[PDB]
Amino acid sequence: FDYQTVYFANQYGLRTIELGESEFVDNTLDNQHKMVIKAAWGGGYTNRNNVVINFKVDESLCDNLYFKDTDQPLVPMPASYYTLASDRIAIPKGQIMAGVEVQLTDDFFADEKSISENYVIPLLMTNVQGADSILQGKPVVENPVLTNAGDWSILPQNFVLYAVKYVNPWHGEYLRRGIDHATVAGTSKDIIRHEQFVENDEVVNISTKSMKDNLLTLKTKDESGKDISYTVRLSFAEDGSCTVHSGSQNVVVSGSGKFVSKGEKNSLGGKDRNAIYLDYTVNLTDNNIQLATKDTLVLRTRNVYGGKSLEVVRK
Ligand SMILES: [Ca+2]
């Protein structure tokens, strides 16, 4: 009398592809530009059949949905940005879960909007072989809408929306120390940014702009003591070196640098650490401040969560 069923355990997901090196998690798939979407089997205890769950891409699942974070709409990921390994998920006899592989193409990573919440892979299960049913939900109204929880007494679990975004290898949270040779409104001075313990150094975020570029927001004082913000753009080459450029309309910038894996020995927490070293010049033309800076940036953590649930709103 048993009634086997298949479903997607989560309806809204956020996958951040973590390129490069991660300490706390295995990102082999990420470095191959891949992700896996998983389905589950239930309503029984032993799966006696080879189960095949057919699904299709259904772009209308995105209708009327917006990211809670940004208030922008969920956008169906363009077909050329990703390749599904199959049109079905197979859960073999004796197994209770399985997944389908997604290969993200170079097209995905070239899109400037792929560094943030924008594109979504939307899937609907169609039929199932080897189990009685797909968990389609129990509607409390006619014309029910899958993505509107209020339309159901038992929620539908036959679809999933995966928002996808990426970070490049240099993306991370870093501790920064260095020396600025400054000229502030004609007055020259050295600014030493150094705390006795690497642990207490200034915390800064290097975010992703593209496959090669990153952004780093900093501040420096004007002649009045007020803090002036500005953004530098780092652009990385195959060999690990970078050039330094402006990322803010208020600053002209030039320089060079490098990422060195394990460049800092017996650094933060006694472990050897990944670091970025910069030698650069900044002209804050509107504020009359010029800085010749040498910086050391120690990696504290990549600060990425590969998989989270996604908060969406239905305006
Ligand atoms: Ca049965």
CATH of the domain at 252: 2.40.128.420
Are residues 21 and 145 located together in one domain of the fold? yes
Angstrom distance (rounded) from CA 138 to CA 144: 9
DSSP-based three-state secondary structure for 145: coil
Q: Tell how far the Cα of 290 is from the centroid of ligand 1, in angstroms.
A: 75
Q: Are 7 and 135 in contact (CB under 8 A)?
A: yes
Q: Tell how far the Cα of 132 is from the centroid of ligand 1, in angstroms.
A: 6
Query: Phi/psi at 256 (nearest 5 deg)?
Result: -140, 165
Are residues 155 and 213 located together in one domain of the fold? no
Are residues 163 and 242 located together in one domain of the fold? no
Q: Are 43 and 4 in contact (CB under 8 A)?
A: yes
Angstrom distance (rounded) from CA 173 to CA 284: 25
Angstrom distance (rounded) from CA 259 to CA 277: 7
Angstrom distance (rounded) from CA 127 to CA 95: 19
DSSP-based three-state secondary structure for 114: helix
Q: Tokens 């679990």 appear where?
A: 157
- Is the alpha carbon torsion for 270, 302, 24, 167 positive or negative? negative
DSSP-based three-state secondary structure for 81: helix
Are residues 315 and 206 located together in one domain of the fold? no
Q: Tell how far the Cα of 43 is from the centroid of ligand 1, in angstroms.
A: 10
Tokens of 141: 């109204």
Q: Tell how far the Cα of 5 is from the centroid of ligand 1, in angstroms.
A: 9
End-to-end C-alpha distance for the chain, whole angstroms: 43
Q: Tell how far the Cα of 127 is from the centroid of ligand 1, in angstroms.
A: 15
Are residues 311 and 260 located together in one domain of the fold? no
Helix, strand, coil percentages, rounded to 5, for the chain: 10, 55, 35
Q: Tell how far the Cα of 313 is from the centroid of ligand 1, in angstroms.
A: 37
DSSP classification of residue 249? T
Are residues 161 and 197 located together in one domain of the fold? no
Q: Tell how far the Cα of 44 is from the centroid of ligand 1, in angstroms.
A: 9
Are residues 159 and 180 located together in one domain of the fold? no
Residue 284: count other Cβ atoms within 10 Å of its Cβ.
20
Q: Tell how far the Cα of 51 is from the centroid of ligand 1, in angstroms.
A: 13
Q: Are 170 and 23 in contact (CB under 8 A)?
A: no
CATH of the domain at 14: 2.60.40.1740
* Nearest Cα residue to 163 out of 210, 106, 116: 116
Are residues 14 and 144 located together in one domain of the fold? yes
Number of domains in the chain: 2
Beta bridge partners of 175: 203, 298
The residue range of the domain holding 182 is 168-303
Q: Tell how far the Cα of 158 is from the centroid of ligand 1, in angstroms.
A: 19
In order of 106, 180, 183, 222, 295, the CA distances from 292 in angstroms are 37, 6, 9, 15, 10
Distance of CA 186 to the CA centre of its chain: 43
Are residues 270 and 311 located together in one domain of the fold? no
Angstrom distance (rounded) from CA 61 to CA 161: 8
Q: Tell how far the Cα of 2 is from the centroid of ligand 1, in angstroms.
A: 5
Q: Tell how far the Cα of 41 is from the centroid of ligand 1, in angstroms.
A: 13
Q: Where are the alpha helices (DSSP H) in 3-149?
A: 28-31, 106-110
Q: Tell how far the Cα of 133 is from the centroid of ligand 1, in angstroms.
A: 9
Residues contacting residue 177 through CB under 8 Å, at least 6 positions apart: 193, 194, 195, 198, 201, 202, 295, 296, 298
Q: Tell how far the Cα of 4 is from the centroid of ligand 1, in angstroms.
A: 6
Method: X-ray
Distance of CA 254 to the CA centre of its chain: 28
Q: Which helix (H) or strand (E) holds 192?
A: strand 187-193
In order of 104, 165, 253, the CA distances from 209 in angstroms are 18, 12, 17
Q: Tell how far the Cα of 46 is from the centroid of ligand 1, in angstroms.
A: 12
Cα angle vertex 242, ends 255, 24, to 5°? 130
Are residues 99 and 29 located together in one domain of the fold? yes
Strands 252-264 and 241-246: antiparallel
Q: Which helix (H) or strand (E) holds 90?
A: strand 88-91
Angstrom distance (rounded) from CA 130 to CA 146: 24
Give the type of residue at 4: Q
Are residues 116 and 129 located together in one domain of the fold? yes
Residues contacting residue 30 through CB under 8 Å, at least 6 positions apart: 17, 18, 19, 306
* Largest separation between any pair of C-alpha atoms in the chain: 87
Q: Tell how far the Cα of 138 is from the centroid of ligand 1, in angstroms.
A: 19
Q: How many CA atoms lie within 13 A of 143 on its CB side?
A: 0
* Nearest Cα residue to 60 out of 130, 145, 127: 145
Tokens of 232: 């530098």
Q: Tell how far the Cα of 129 is from the centroid of ligand 1, in angstroms.
A: 12
Distance of CA 266 to the CA centre of its chain: 29
Q: Tell how far the Cα of 93 is from the centroid of ligand 1, in angstroms.
A: 15
Query: Phi/psi at 269 (nearest 5 deg)?
Result: 55, 25
DSSP-based three-state secondary structure for 104: strand
Q: Tell how far the Cα of 1 is from the centroid of ligand 1, in angstroms.
A: 6
Are residues 36 and 72 located together in one domain of the fold? yes
In order of 214, 267, 300, the CA distances from 271 in angstroms are 25, 6, 11
